[PDB]
Amino acid sequence: ATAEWITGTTSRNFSVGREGLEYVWGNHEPVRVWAQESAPGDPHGWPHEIIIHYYHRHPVYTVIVLCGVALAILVGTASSAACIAKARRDCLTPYALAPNA
Amino acid sequence: ATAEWITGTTSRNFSVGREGLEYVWGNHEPVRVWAQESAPGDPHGWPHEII
Amino acid sequence: FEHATTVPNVPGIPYKALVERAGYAPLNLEITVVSSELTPSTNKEYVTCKFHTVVPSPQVKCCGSLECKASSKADYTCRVFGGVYPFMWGGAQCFCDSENTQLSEAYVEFAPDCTIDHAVALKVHTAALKVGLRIVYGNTTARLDTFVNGVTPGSSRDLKVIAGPISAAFSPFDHKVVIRKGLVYNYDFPEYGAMNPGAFGDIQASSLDATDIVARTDIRLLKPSVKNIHVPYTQAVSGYEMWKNNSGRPLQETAPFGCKIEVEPLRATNCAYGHIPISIDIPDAAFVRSSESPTILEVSCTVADCIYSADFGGSLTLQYKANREGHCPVHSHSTTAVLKEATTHVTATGSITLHFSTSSPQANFIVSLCGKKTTCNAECKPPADHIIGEPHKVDQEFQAAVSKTSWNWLLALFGGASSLIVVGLIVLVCSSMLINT
Numbered sequence A: 001a002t003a004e005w006i007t008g009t010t011s012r013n014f015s016v017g018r019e020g021l022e023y024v025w026g027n028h029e030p031v032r033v034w035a036q037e038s039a040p041g042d043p044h045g046w047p048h049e050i051i052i053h054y055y056h057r058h059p060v061y062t063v064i065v066l067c068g069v070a071l072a073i074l075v076g077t078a079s080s081a082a083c084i085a086k087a088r089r090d091c092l093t094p095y096a097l098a099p100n101a
Numbered sequence B: 001a002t003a004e005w006i007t008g009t010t011s012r013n014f015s016v017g018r019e020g021l022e023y024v025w026g027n028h029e030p031v032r033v034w035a036q037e038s039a040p041g042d043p044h045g046w047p048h049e050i051i
Numbered sequence C: 001f002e003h004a005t006t007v008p009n010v011p012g013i014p015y016k017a018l019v020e021r022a023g024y025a026p027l028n029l030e031i032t033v034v035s036s037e038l039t040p041s042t043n044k045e046y047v048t049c050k051f052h053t054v055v056p057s058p059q060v061k062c063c064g065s066l067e068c069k070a071s072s073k074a075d076y077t078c079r080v081f082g083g084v085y086p087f088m089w090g091g092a093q094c095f096c097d098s099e100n101t102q103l104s105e106a107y108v109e110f111a112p113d114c115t116i117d118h119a120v121a122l123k124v125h126t127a128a129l130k131v132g133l134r135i136v137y138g139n140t141t142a143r144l145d146t147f148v149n150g151v152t153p154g155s156s157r158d159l160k161v162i163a164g165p166i167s168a169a170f171s172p173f174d175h176k177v178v179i180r181k182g183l184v185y186n187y188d189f190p191e192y193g194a195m196n197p198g199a200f201g202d203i204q205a206s207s208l209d210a211t212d213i214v215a216r217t218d219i220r221l222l223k224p225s226v227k228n229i230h231v232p233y234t235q236a237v238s239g240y241e242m243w244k245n246n247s248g249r250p251l252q253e254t255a256p257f258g259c260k261i262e263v264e265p266l267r268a269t270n271c272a273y274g275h276i277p278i279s280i281d282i283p284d285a286a287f288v289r290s291s292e293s294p295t296i297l298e299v300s301c302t303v304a305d306c307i308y309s310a311d312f313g314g315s316l317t318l319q320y321k322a323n324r325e326g327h328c329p330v331h332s333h334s335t336t337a338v339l340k341e342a343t344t345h346v347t348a349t350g351s352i353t354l355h356f357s358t359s360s361p362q363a364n365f366i367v368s369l370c371g372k373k374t375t376c377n378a379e380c381k382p383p384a385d386h387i388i389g390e391p392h393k394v395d396q397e398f399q400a401a402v403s404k405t406s407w408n409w410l411l412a413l414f415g416g417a418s419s420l421i422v423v424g425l426i427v428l429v430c431s432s433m434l435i436n437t
């Protein structure tokens, strides 16, 4: 709740969420506004538009999802390459102990 | 020396030692107060109390 | 029939239900909360106001003492003065040269205008909802008031409705509340008799017309200095006035969840803070047999220009073929998309348009037209309007809020990582089998 005595002409910024915001200006009746998700992007498009749209909607959730999928692909590629390297080692070890084979 | 013009009901804290504190509130005769070494604990008891 | 469903506590936003008995036509059920009242149990401690501190005419005795008698008036202060010489206009007022006693009296009283500008102190123990429900079913309406406690069946003249226990208990008022001219404050006022000068509750009484007024105003009687008569008293300022000057903002401007605080009685109206599980005993006369309802043979839905928002930003056209003309309801089977119209009119080989509000980027939800289920599936665009004047009709879910394209990319990356993991373990198992042989 913010209460302010205002004189002259000014501009006041108020963050409205999905829960809404009710403001009373002077003797006028209260005005209730609800914020609807209108991020500057397209959820059905290229990945960067989806990423910026969801980041403008929820920044921490989008960044932790992006970090999770980046970690998932790095671990997947690294462990797959480790398995390929181990298979190559176990396959070529008998042929590496004999030059004449 | 602390000097302040005060309007309305309010509370003011002041630090006094063994030397003393003399305050004058408006047009009244000055009032003297003296502090004594009454601190929590016990000089005759368990060691943590005296510490 | 008995149907239990959970409704949000939002004033407005009617809640959709489709009750479906085994051998009866599906029946619509709109459950709307038109009013709500958190009314707590309040008892009063005292009432306070700006005092009057009337000082009567001082008593004089001359060559004689005036040891004062104790009285039961509010904040009584009697004090004796020696060596006084009273003097009104016209001359010195008594014979005795210097050994005079002056009894100075000072008690305190309510101001004459305390019948309007007074603050009443109350305790708040617990508050229980009393919600007004508009329930319509089978073209029959019912407006009825219920207590949200799980046992009270409300106004069950014909429809038996039990509002089960709400998920969260809010209670916007704290334990101690001050009410002044219709303004409600959460103030920690002192107890009855534990009075403090220069602060709220300095003067207390059980009623405005009560006689047992108690006060601690820190009134001090001073020895007179000038020759003329007067009673010099120094007194702390009114704690009522200090609390008026430092009241903060009342609960009509700072209560959470948008609760409108009203007085006589003290209550909080029209605010949403949880979910009400309502169980309804719908009478069997409301239902009709499935043979009396026009069944559907073929039906297909196409949505057009879906915009997910708080307003009804959908328009789906259902093309149908039916046996016979009649009115029979329609429902949306997902919690993300809710329809606007509950009961539609279906005749034959035609199309009906309907409006829905959704909170998902994808409209992929089941619509039951009069018994038959169809999967409406397309994409919804984000709104161009940033701020709207009506509350959101659907709460957001994590699975719904992610579109098909975003889920496709997410499972694409996850499936790629998992597929490389599986093929790595496969070639490792193949190498282990080769070296084991």
Ligand SMILES: *[C@@H]1O[C@H](CO)[C@@H](O)[C@H](O)[C@H]1NC(C)=O
Pocket: A011, A013
């Ligand atoms: C208020 O927010 C707007 C965003 O539309 C911004 O342009 C403007 O500078 C803000 N004003 C203040 C005083 O912060």
Ligand SMILES: *[C@@H]1O[C@H](CO)[C@@H](O)[C@H](O)[C@H]1NC(C)=O
Pocket: B011, B012, B013
């Ligand atoms: C004065 O000291 C008391 C000691 O308990 C403390 O509670 C109070 O906050 C202090 N007030 C100021 C104005 O420093």
Ligand SMILES: *[C@@H]1O[C@H](CO)[C@@H](O)[C@H](O)[C@H]1NC(C)=O
Pocket: B008, C245, C246
């Ligand atoms: C009390 O009222 C006066 C009136 O001018 C105002 O200046 C002041 O801020 C108020 N509050 C206090 C704590 O003195």
